[PDB]
Scaffold this active site. Structure first.
Site, short mmCIF file in Angstrom:
data_model
loop_
_atom_site.label_atom_id
_atom_site.label_comp_id
_atom_site.label_asym_id
_atom_site.label_seq_id
_atom_site.Cartn_x
_atom_site.Cartn_y
_atom_site.Cartn_z
CG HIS B 73 86.26 8.99 -60.84
ND1 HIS B 73 85.67 8.02 -61.06
CD2 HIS B 73 86.34 9.61 -62.33
CE1 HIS B 73 86.14 7.11 -61.43
NE2 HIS B 73 86.77 8.06 -62.51
CG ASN B 234 96.11 8.80 -61.93
OD1 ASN B 234 94.72 8.37 -61.68
ND2 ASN B 234 95.74 10.10 -62.48
#
Ligand SMILES: COc1c(OCC2CC2)cc2oc3cc4c(c(OCc5ccncc5)c3c(=O)c2c1CC=C(C)C)C=CC(C)(C)O4
Ligand SMILES: COc1c(OCC2CC2)cc2oc3cc4c(c(OCc5ccncc5)c3c(=O)c2c1CC=C(C)C)C=CC(C)(C)O4
Ligand SMILES: [Mg+2]
Ligand SMILES: [Mg+2]
Ligand SMILES: [Zn+2]
Ligand SMILES: [Zn+2]
Lengths: 323, 323
Positions: B73, B234
């Site tokens: 993150h 992703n």
């Protein structure tokens, strides 16, 4: 002088307690003495193993974080909502319905539900790009803040009144308290009332006539509306109490409208001390908000709340007569 | 170095941009250069009169508030979600459905959607009684914080990229950004997907096939599920990219589980480096979350999502074969 205060606190189970007298008699500590009186009355210190010195320390710190210079949203309002919730909890239709933990959650939520209120509305905080609205993304800005402050103060020195609850009890209390205080956001009233009405229409009672609540969703919804009713209980109180609540909200609204004037903003409804209609606004608020709410609550607990509803209707008639 | 960076950026409209390469070549500034490029490509500095230096100053303060020591993150994930949203907003089946302000909001929301992430989950923040969870009352704790930080940074010197929007435009953008970022909260995934499914079964299109969305409620829902898709994209990227994302999220998860272990806490799923099944977890994440989401979104934008949905099935088959 403490004799007289103790005398007034014998009324703690009654609607229309002299809350402003108690505020004066207690040295501007109505929230501490009323909460303490109620915890003793309900045996909550014993039940949850709350040290009395811890209770008093937290209460006085909590009460300190209400603004003495805000005319309505101060420690007296907090004490009054606490006490009104305490009465609503005792209604015959609800006997043995709520656990001790749920009772504690409702009373605690009432005590903290407006702490650190600055005397201006959520909308004002959003429109003025306040730090509070920026912290809370314009969503239940004040109510989130009241929760955050109310829980944070538990961590001050000798302030954790829940120090002897189990982990599961603390976790459950925290969630209920959050659910309850967030429901005091006035922008949630219509959806809250719509849900209360559905419950009244599909109401189930037990073999003893007491309300029957099967699940968390129904139990929390009842406690949410209960504290919301206590929050909106001024027009149901004896008229000398109600009129003083009206003086105070109007003073507080007028100060926000001055600040709105000082900034060239459009002045919010009821905030313009030069174009005010105090009586019309109270009649409007009762007809569109307070009576629809209290009439639905009265149905849920029928006939427990008949006298409260009759007072509301008389007070509406009185304010109407002055137009 | 400068010249090759510019050549990689020429893929800014393609699913599968080499974002780690761009991060390397830009001096750990992928968020800034990808946001800068996308604003050019979409003519947003002209359309909204954003001074180019103001854009750069804000984008660099923003990027600095993503943590360099957080494995997943961080600013690379922010840059990747931005560019992914940029691509999904060009889905022919979405015909400039969205106004230029609705486009600006989805891209700005993408850029800030994880800012100042500490590398631990919402549940970890709740269980450790963190400052963040105490501020935000356990509800969308991180996502509220990302919003509050992303907006607050606009107030730094020469960082207000919205200075030349009208007051109403700013108000509309702020609401849309809040609504989008709040929807990245993973606990809202199922409801969000439910709503996307309803929108698919009662969908309405031109004969040319292009989607007709008339009310704000449905248009914000699409943009919420869109940035949600971009956050969960992703496993739809080329495998060389996806594997790197998997390495980073597992490292971040393992570090949380190490903090959970030394604290004596119950270690969260996929966070126990001594008992993980990295490939099984990815396959399970695809089967239960990522494929249902992208299969519902492919329906919504038929045929535009087939190349994306194809890569996802390829990548799921590969991970399964490593078991
Ligand atoms: C319909 O809009 C109105 C309104 O319309 C009628 C207009 C005249 C035409 C009148 C109102 O009059 C008030 C009078 C009051 C008090 C008030 O409550 C403040 C409050 C804020 C936050 N939490 C809890 C309470 C209000 C209102 O809020 C209010 C609202 C807003 C309500 C809603 C958006 C659902 C409080 C105490 C007493 C009872 C003393 O006076
Ligand atoms: C079903 O629960 C699972 C889950 O079980 C199914 C599998 C059997 C175990 C597996 C998971 O595996 C993941 C693998 C990941 C990433 C993940 O996303 C982190 C995230 C956190 C916060 N915001 C946005 C994203 C997750 C999960 O979150 C996740 C969840 C929680 C999700 C939900 C409750 C909706 C992110 C990046 C990549 C794709 C590289 O890997
Ligand atoms: Mg309030
Ligand atoms: Mg996130
Ligand atoms: Zn109140
Ligand atoms: Zn993310």
């Amino acid at each position: 002088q403490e004799d007289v205060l103790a005398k007034e606190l014998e009324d703690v189970n009654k609607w229309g307690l002299h809350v402003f007298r108690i505020a004066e008699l207690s040295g501007n500590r109505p929230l501490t003495v009323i909460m303490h009186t109620i915890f003793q009355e309900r045996d909550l210190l014993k039940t949850f193993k709350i040290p009395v010195d811890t209770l008093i320390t937290y209460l006085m710190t909590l009460e300190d974080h209400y603004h003495a210079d805000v005319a309505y949203h101060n420690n007296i309002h907090a004490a009054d909502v606490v006490q009104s919730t305490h009465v609503l909890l005792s209604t015959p239709a609800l006997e043995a319905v709520f656990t001790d933990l749920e009772i504690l959650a409702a009373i605690f939520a009432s005590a903290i539900h407006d702490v650190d209120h600055p005397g201006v509305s959520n909308q004002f905080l959003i429109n003025t790009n306040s730090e509070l609205a920026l912290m809370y993304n314009d969503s239940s800005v004040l109510e989130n803040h009241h929760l955050a402050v109310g829980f944070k103060l538990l961590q001050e020195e000798n302030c954790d009144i829940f120090q002897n609850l189990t982990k599961k009890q603390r976790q459950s209390l925290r969630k209920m308290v959050i659910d309850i205080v967030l429901a005091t956001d006035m922008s949630k009233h219509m959806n809250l009332l719509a849900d209360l009405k559905t419950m009244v229409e599909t109401k189930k009672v037990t073999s003893s006539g007491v309300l029957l609540l099967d699940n968390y969703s129904d139990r929390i919804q009842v406690l949410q509306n209960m504290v919301h009713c206590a929050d909106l209980s001024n027009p149901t109180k004896p008229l000398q109490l109600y009129r003083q609540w009206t003086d105070r909200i109007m003073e507080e609204f007028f100060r926000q409208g001055d600040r709105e004037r000082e900034r060239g903003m459009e002045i919010s409804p009821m905030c313009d001390k030069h174009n005010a209609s105090v009586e019309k606004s109270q009649v409007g608020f009762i007809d569109y908000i307070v009576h629809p709410l209290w009439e639905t609550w009265a149905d849920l607990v029928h006939p427990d709340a008949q006298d409260i509803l009759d007072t509301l209707e008389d007070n509406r008639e009185w304010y109407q007569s002055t137009i």
